[PDB]
Design brief:
1287 residues, alpha+beta, Zincin-like, Clostridium botulinum neurotoxin B, "coiled-coil" domain, 4 domains, 12-stranded antiparallel β-sheet, 9-stranded mixed β-sheet, 63 strands, binds zinc ion, disulfide bond, host cell membrane
Length: 1287
Amino acid sequence: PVTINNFNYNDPIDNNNIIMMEPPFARGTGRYYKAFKITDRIWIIPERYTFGYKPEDFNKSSGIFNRDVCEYYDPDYLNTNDKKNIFLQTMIKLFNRIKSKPLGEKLLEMIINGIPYLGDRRVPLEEFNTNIASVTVNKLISNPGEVERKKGIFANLIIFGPGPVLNENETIDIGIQNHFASREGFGGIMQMKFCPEYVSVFNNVQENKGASIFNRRGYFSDPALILMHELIHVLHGLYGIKVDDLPIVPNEKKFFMQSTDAIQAEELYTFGGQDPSIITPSTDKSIYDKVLQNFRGIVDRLNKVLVCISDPNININIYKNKFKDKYKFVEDSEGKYSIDVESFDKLYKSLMFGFTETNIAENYKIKTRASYFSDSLPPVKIKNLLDNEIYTIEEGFNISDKDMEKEYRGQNKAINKQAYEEISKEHLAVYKIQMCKSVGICIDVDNEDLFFIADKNSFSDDLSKNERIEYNTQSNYIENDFPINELILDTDLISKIELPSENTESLTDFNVDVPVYEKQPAIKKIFTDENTIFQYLYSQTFPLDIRDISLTSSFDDALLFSNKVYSFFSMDYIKTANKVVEAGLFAGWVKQIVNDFVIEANKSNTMDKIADISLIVPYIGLALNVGNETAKGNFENAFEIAGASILLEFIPELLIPVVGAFLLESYIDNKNKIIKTIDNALTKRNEKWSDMYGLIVAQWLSTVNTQFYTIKEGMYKALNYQAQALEEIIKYRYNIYSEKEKSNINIDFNDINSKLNEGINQAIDNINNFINGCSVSYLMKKMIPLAVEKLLDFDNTLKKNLLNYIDENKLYLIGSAEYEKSKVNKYLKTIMPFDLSIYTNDTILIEMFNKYNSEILNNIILNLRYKDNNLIDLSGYGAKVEVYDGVELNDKNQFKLTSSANSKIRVTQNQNIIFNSVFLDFSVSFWIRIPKYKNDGIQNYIHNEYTIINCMKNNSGWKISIRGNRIIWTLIDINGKTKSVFFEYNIREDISEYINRWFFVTITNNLNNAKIYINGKLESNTDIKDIREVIANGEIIFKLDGDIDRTQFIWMKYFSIFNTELSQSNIEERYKIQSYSEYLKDFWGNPLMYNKEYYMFNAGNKNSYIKLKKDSPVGEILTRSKYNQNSKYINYRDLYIGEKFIIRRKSNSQSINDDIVRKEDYIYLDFFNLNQEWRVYTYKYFKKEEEKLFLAPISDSDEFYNTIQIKEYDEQPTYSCQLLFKKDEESTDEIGLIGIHRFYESGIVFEEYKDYFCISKWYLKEVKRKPYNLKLGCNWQFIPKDEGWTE
Ligand SMILES: [Zn+2]
Ligand SMILES: [Zn+2]
């Protein structure tokens, strides 16, 4: 158990638990400090830490000590005896809180028992030397006013009050002769400068501080956790494992880069959470090896220690027993000490990954920042930690009896205001970057606000070094994890070996290195004319002495005029915001503009499914202009083209080493040591794959995810600025009214802020999801593939290495040099799938990753889309696309392959994507339009098969071909085995749904089957179990290849590939998404156009057509003529028959050239009667359900409706459209829909039924039924002449 002593500052010195100490950095000179033993080996000195600091530096100045902290100064802190006592009682309380839980009590016990080794690197192996400043510290015994009598004491930790900056707690170790015992296995007296009242403040990005931006936000820290965080540094120092290694160093070459001190791995381990993942596996092992090496030395010393020259009264056995337990060494029956690999592993992991701030916070239910790299905020002062009503040993601030236990409410600034106080900005110093334009206007930006982008030097290159493989050689994995539960329940973690007595010989050798500190300018001036995130956010603010502002979409005007504030919202939002109204309409205006704000912010949930992008925040570019000028042009389009990359302020240069060669050692005649060498090289090979992935994750987190973090913070600010600006305008407009008017104005400001704040929170969730998706995207598409390239390169080199090895040793392997020959091929065949959960256990990061992987659209590895008269890959994997001269492209994403040799597309796929899942798993989707057969060429049409898309690599791969009316999917495994599946449409149908008409194809492949879907419907299936490995990432050639007719061609659109099997549901959705359009379509599926001759087709009367009746103004319905020749293979009804109609636009006299017909458009349905253009009319006064339509010259009669509204009542894909007659555009008086009705005719000669072109009110209710009735006679399609259809 741990005992916390009690005492008051004014208690008498007793030379035992209350002494006059001579601090290590005092150098044996100067005065002593009253010190109190809070627990064994731990001392509290309630005075300011002054070592290495200038007295005047305790005052706030124009300088700062740390560039990444909002430094609070207060020279009066601890200047009275009562203040000192308050410090003592507070430390006593924090220590009691720490030991209130097993985990903290164990941290304390480990610290108390972790006594420094008696000596350091300079001491001979056979001795203990207590006479060094890192082991012995002195206390003055003699009466006051004379250093006549001193006495030495061993100590582990000395805690002082703060140095110049109250909120900059720090643990310091003792260096002597340029070396640190606490970094070389010995350990040494540790010191700390700590302040309990002025705690740090933080806020979660992916969260919301009490869902309030108008109130105080963020949470304040629990000083007990702040203390335990420093105690962890102490722990590492005491065990001599606070080693230095390759540090994370920030890139500072650009003005937008954050400047900070180098960050050591030990600091990231101490914090825990995701930070350890920023330390590559290479560096993890390097640190591991150094500490292990350190322990080897200590254990050798324990085997050689014979005497303690400095102090004859030191019992050697007692210390050997204690050090044996401290380091978990094992001892044989004789007394020989050695390192037990298992116990060392556990101790190491316990100290570096068990005791972490993150683990402790979770355990004590204390909230803390998410990452080391999180924006630091202004500190706050805690009123009274000694008041159990505000802070308790058991629960800290989160007291259940006050209902502050849930959601860390007790630490919430917006909730527990009675626990803290804000700090005077006059006492705060912050390092700023003053960005000046070469003129001049200057903007100050806190260094904290900039982009932290780790420099390339931050990462180890140990992967490039060679590895010697032996029958011994084994894997080396360090789990940056440690079950806190076992640690808390570990039985032999805490020593039960006697702590030696602290009294010893006085220290006479005060030699020690004392650090010297000094402030640096708090402001650094830089020159740049860039208008990036910093300037854009600045343009959205206004001076405090201004109360009348107006919004503007002009960024430059906003920067120029102090009364102009930039807004990235809609033009309409901006105009309404600057609108002035009479008192009577003010409340209405407020409701309006506030509602408009929420609508604008809500646009952050915009979808862009047609471009294969589920979520897009359209205004991010306008708001920050971050990255590659995202404020210019249209952000959505730019994002579709480049993706996540356009938002990054900087594109990092990744460290992706060529893995070092393997040197296998031979064992002539040893059939076992040789077999092992091969197996070990395989396992080692996997270690290289995992390590490389770890190296990627570290760079991603410290150079890419950090930038996206800043963008997220940037948006939160931009949104808040917009709300702040609107709030300001509302206040001004309201205050212009007299008191009498205000009384009759119904307004509630709190609720206004409430609604605005709500809109903001909703937008933040959308933005956070968008940005996280962008970050994972960059990792997966821009980083992982580059690593894979090298790893595959390494594989090959290793393959020819192992084979050649099995050759030179063929003899000593006799009848097996073949069994393992393939053993190598099958091992280096399966690559290691990247799994982020292996490199980190951070819930937020894992969820980000799993979410990304659950989105089917991220499985797209090729997506050919039209852009600037060219086809490019928008999958984000950078496939190279060469479109030769003979290919026809249009902005409707349609491309035509002709019989010309230059009508070809060459696609070189990214060879670095896990495509060969070792069992064939991928899909191909695209739209196609295949022209009708030539009647006089039916034999060749049905006989000649021709390839259209070929993807072959090493005589293996896939292919898409066509033979007449059949489309074929062919696979060819490495063995040459071939399998096919096909879809054949009928060429004898009176009316075909497929011939010369756009339709949707999707082919899916999995371990068992090959399925072909047509317009979302499964059509074919083929068992492909026999088929073996299929190489699919070869070059893709789009070209008509075979014995074709010179006239042969094929149109295609939206060709894409997925590296997974699409489900019927995915396909249906894709079919629906890609079928969607604002415009109507024609019979062939192309956009319906105005001023274009069209024959009419009726879906309910397929074989019927309209013809102006000879003697009357009506359209009789006749039967379509048909294919007349004698071929047995074909049949069809003529399509180019009947009147030739032409659709004319109704509104705006923009002439009759041509344009796209959209749903709901008002039109005139005309047709050519010889050399004249006639019109389709509806007699206004009919009372029956239907009536025949009236066809006549163009004219305007009061008795006939002449205006039609083209509609689309079908919710599902169809090329059919409906034609509605309304009383007039405005009215909701529907006359009826155009269709076909049957009439009975009985005359003097003929008796029969005849159908006519009509209008019926009956259809009005029928088109509402679900599912939509495709057979309805009011369903029409327009057929223009098309080269793809001849009759
Ligand atoms: Zn730290
Ligand atoms: Zn940072």
